[PDB]
Amino acid sequence: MLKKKQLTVLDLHPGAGKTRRVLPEIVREAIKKRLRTVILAPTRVVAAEMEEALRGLPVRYMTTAVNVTHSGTEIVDLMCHATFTSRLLQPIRVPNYNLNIMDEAHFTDPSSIAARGYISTRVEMGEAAAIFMTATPPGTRDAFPDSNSPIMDTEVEVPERAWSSGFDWVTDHSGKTVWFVPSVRNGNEIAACLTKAGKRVIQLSRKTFETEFQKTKNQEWDFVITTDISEMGANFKADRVIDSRRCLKPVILDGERVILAGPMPVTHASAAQRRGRIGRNPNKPGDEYMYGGGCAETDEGHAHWLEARMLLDNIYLQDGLIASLYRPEADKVAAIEGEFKLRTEQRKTFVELMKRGDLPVWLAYQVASAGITYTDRRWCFDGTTNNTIMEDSVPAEVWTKYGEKRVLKPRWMDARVCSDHAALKSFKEFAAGKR
Numbered sequence: 001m002l003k004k005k006q007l008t009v010l011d012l013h014p015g016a017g018k019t020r021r022v023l024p025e026i027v028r029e030a031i032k033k034r035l036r037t038v039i040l041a042p043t044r045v046v047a048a049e050m051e052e053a054l055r056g057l058p059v060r061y062m063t064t065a066v067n068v069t070h071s072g073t074e075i076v077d078l079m080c081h082a083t084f085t086s087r088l089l090q091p092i093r094v095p096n097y098n099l100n101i102m103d104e105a106h107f108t109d110p111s112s113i114a115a116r117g118y119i120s121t122r123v124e125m126g127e128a129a130a131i132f133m134t135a136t137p138p139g140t141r142d143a144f145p146d147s148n149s150p151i152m153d154t155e156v157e158v159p160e161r162a163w164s165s166g167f168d169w170v171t172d173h174s175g176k177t178v179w180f181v182p183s184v185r186n187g188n189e190i191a192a193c194l195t196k197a198g199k200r201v202i203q204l205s206r207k208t209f210e211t212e213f214q215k216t217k218n219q220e221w222d223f224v225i226t227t228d229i230s231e232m233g234a235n236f237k238a239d240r241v242i243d244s245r246r247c248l249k250p251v252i253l254d255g256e257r258v259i260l261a262g263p264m265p266v267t268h269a270s271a272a273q274r275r276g277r278i279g280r281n282p283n284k285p286g287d288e289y290m291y292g293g294g295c296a297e298t299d300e301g302h303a304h305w306l307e308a309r310m311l312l313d314n315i316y317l318q319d320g321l322i323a324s325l326y327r328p329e330a331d332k333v334a335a336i337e338g339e340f341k342l343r344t345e346q347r348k349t350f351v352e353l354m355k356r357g358d359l360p361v362w363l364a365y366q367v368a369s370a371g372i373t374y375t376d377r378r379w380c381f382d383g384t385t386n387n388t389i390m391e392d393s394v395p396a397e398v399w400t401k402y403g404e405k406r407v408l409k410p411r412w413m414d415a416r417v418c419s420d421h422a423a424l425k426s427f428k429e430f431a432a433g434k435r
């Protein structure tokens with residue numbers, strides 16, 4: 001695998017030991033061959049699990065998820081997918097890694113797709129080697145891969161709302177269930193219904209995942225209600241997955257706004273990862289996978305692949321060359337390489353709107369490309385009436401940094417800034433000039 005110009009897809013089935021068995025063998029070989037190596041973890045939770053798998057090996061943990069004293073002599077770096085792409089975008093030196101290892105390489109967040117684009121382009125140029133570790137590479141059509149123990153697969157109607165009757169199988173279960181929902185708001189309603197029926201429920205989503213995932217270890221629980229973030233190497237001692245088989249799809253309409261379309265079917269890769277949360281213990285056969293819909297290739301025309309192009313157009317590779325998307329996922333977007341390349345000062349603005357602003361990539365791009373500076377929030381208030389953001393069925397209002405109460409009416413509307421109470425709170429703080 002470690003030979004230059006090679007990209008290896010390590011596609012062992014979920015739970016086959018890619019992270020805890022194969023990765024340390026790769027890292028030992030890389031250190032023997034003096035290969036400057038990066039390991040990319042999808043989440044801080046996975047970064048911390050990797051530290052335990054790699055304990056004893058000289059690895060620099062570029063994450064405060066790991067409390068360690070480095071020797072200063074490590075040639076293997078470990079960081080999150082998003083940290084890698086973030087450092088590439090910023091005026092910070094990123095070494096030209098001889099070996100690029102991406103764990104949970106199916107992750108479809110924009111920064112992960114961009115990282116795979118950059119890495120696969122370096123390999124195609126003859127500059128580097130890469131290993132992409134995932135049971136579900138792009139375009140996989142198999143939702144039911146192999147497992148460590150037999151799984152009971154059942155197609156069944158799954159609730160997406162509070163229910164009073166007709167789903168006794170949900171609550172009659174005496175084990176632990178991981179339940180994949182299409183959104184935070186949908187999970188909130190299911191979680192409230194289970195709580196009212198006497199169940200102990202933990203909710204996971206992107207913003208809460210590091211903090212809340214620890215509860216799955218520290219407290220007894222009956223249900224984990226999760227969004228798709230638990231597709232990225234989240235491990236549970238569970239005996240059942242309930243899978244809506246539904247997700248939200250960010251869609252750019254008419255180049256001018258982002259909507260959260262659906263819910264609609266998950267990809268086969270997502271469904272396989274959701275199912276792959278169970279059947280992991282060869283001593284516990286008959287874990288259950290209950291699934292409530294079919295799969296579809298809903299990654300086609302998904303905003304994340306366009307956002308990945310906006311990130312890659314703004315990463316230096318060599319002169320004016322621009323990294324391509326990883327070939328198997330390159331058709332998911334109709335984009336022109338370089339169309340989103342910003343001049344130096346607009347690029348800095350773009351980066352700060354994502355990093356400090358915490359805005360979605362698409363929205364950061366609209367603001368930066370308009371020649372707006374990071375602290376200029378006038379655009380949060382001067383949009384069309386149809387861009388009015390609602391809070392409890394009334395227009396949302398903030399006090400501007402000038403001390404004026406104004407209706408939130410962004411010039412560019414991206415549904416992800418108000419998809420749940422926490423998102424809208426963060427966007428209100430941004431519009432007010434509070435970060």
Ligand SMILES: OCc1ccc(-n2cnc3ccccc32)cc1
Nearest residue numbers: 060061062063064070083086087
């Ligand atoms: O680019 C942002 C960012 C992310 C991670 C870190 N970081 C945390 N612990 C570290 C140890 C070694 C090198 C970098 C480290 C710094 C900066």
